[PDB]
């Protein structure tokens, strides 16, 4: 169960980074002063957002850009909680055994 | 199992911070305006990136610098998921027992 939930989350995270990159540019163009407006740097912004690093070099200023950002965040965080929970499950079993 | 995976991750993380520091400078010099260009501050940037703190004082502006940054991030995050999963495994056993 756990590994499949984790693997799926990883696949789902990759999809969210790419879709999030596309949707962030769509949301932010048309807002004066917005910088999250070209796709290559938007993919970079989605990665530093999903990992929760959040340098501050780029960020959304619109309502829809910010909603996209929160989905990226939660997708990243969730994937990591799942990988962590999966590692714990693995270890717990190998330790029962040892 | 768990402690060795954790210990190894810690050793591997130290290697990634040093190699990441070297590779980030290599990637960023030659890009006008880049600031992640000397080794001492690049090691500092790798540490605040791996812990996901990400102050924003320094960051990569090139494609390869950013790929290096994502490896540092994932190495940091993974090490911590492993330590956490290791602590859970330890506790779970001592509690079966208690």
């Amino acid at each position, epitope marked *: 169960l756990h590994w499949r939930a984790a693997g799926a989350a990883t696949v789902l995270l990759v999809i969210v980074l790419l879709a999030g990159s596309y949707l962030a*540019v*769509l949301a932010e*163009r048309g807002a*004066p002063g*917005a*910088q999250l407006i070209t*796709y290559p740097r938007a993919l970079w912004w989605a990665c530093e957002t999903a990992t929760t690093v959040x340098y501050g070099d780029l960020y959304p200023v619109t309502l829809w850009g910010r909603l996209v950002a929160v989905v990226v965040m939660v997708a990243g965080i969730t994937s990591f909680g799942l990988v962590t929970a999966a590692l714990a499950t693995w270890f717990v079993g190998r330790e029962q055994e040892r | 199992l768990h402690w060795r995976a954790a210990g190894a991750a810690t050793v591997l993380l130290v290697i990634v911070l040093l190699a990441g520091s070297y590779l980030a400078v290599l990637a960023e010099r030659g890009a*006008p305006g880049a600031q992640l260009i000397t080794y001492p501050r690049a090691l500092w940037w790798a540490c605040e990136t791996a812990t996901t703190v990400x102050y924003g004082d320094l960051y990569p502006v090139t494609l390869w610098g950013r790929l290096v940054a994502v490896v540092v991030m994932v190495a940091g995050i993974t090490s911590f998921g492993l330590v956490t999963a290791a602590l859970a495994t330890w506790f779970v056993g001592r509690e079966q027992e208690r």
Partner: antibody
Amino acid sequence: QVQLQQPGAELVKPGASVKLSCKASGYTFTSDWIHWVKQRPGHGLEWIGEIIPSYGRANYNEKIQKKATLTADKSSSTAFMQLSSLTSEDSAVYYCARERGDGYFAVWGAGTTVTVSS
Amino acid sequence: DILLTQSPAILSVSPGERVSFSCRASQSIGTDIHWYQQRTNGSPRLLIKYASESISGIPSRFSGSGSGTDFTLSINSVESEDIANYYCQQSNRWPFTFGSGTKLEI
């Protein structure tokens, strides 16, 4: 082959409207945006607006009076700019240009010379 | 919105000489500047992207430099075919904007 094809000219009476076209060929991606640029004789390049065909959303220059409405047809790979209620101030060459979502205009159409006159 | 100032508006050089066009942004835009050449009655043509990157098909004669607020387009050894108007354009913040253009005279 020519990546963006535009008609050479359009004559428009003051107050009437006209719909300019820009037929695209070559590689097409979901990240493409088509932009329109206005250039009066002897003057510079003025950005009018952009549209992303894959989604149909358009943005416009807020600094100027809005004379344009952008649309795009996916099946005919054609982008359109509806100019309405024109005056002589609207007489100029209007170019369409393609941007691959990375900020620069890789290719430009030949431009349509629009003359507003009776 | 970002203002791009190109000055002087007219640059006169002697054949074969190195010439440089200036583009100054009203605020720092990294290296998000692109340059176009527009010959008389022609449409604009991209020459350099992201301040210094080459475009295939463009003579090696052209190059770009700068970051922040000050950018330069240089032509090593100008020749007649370089006679044209040159424009810079930024893509750092929305909306994209253009400089007012510099004409090269030989």
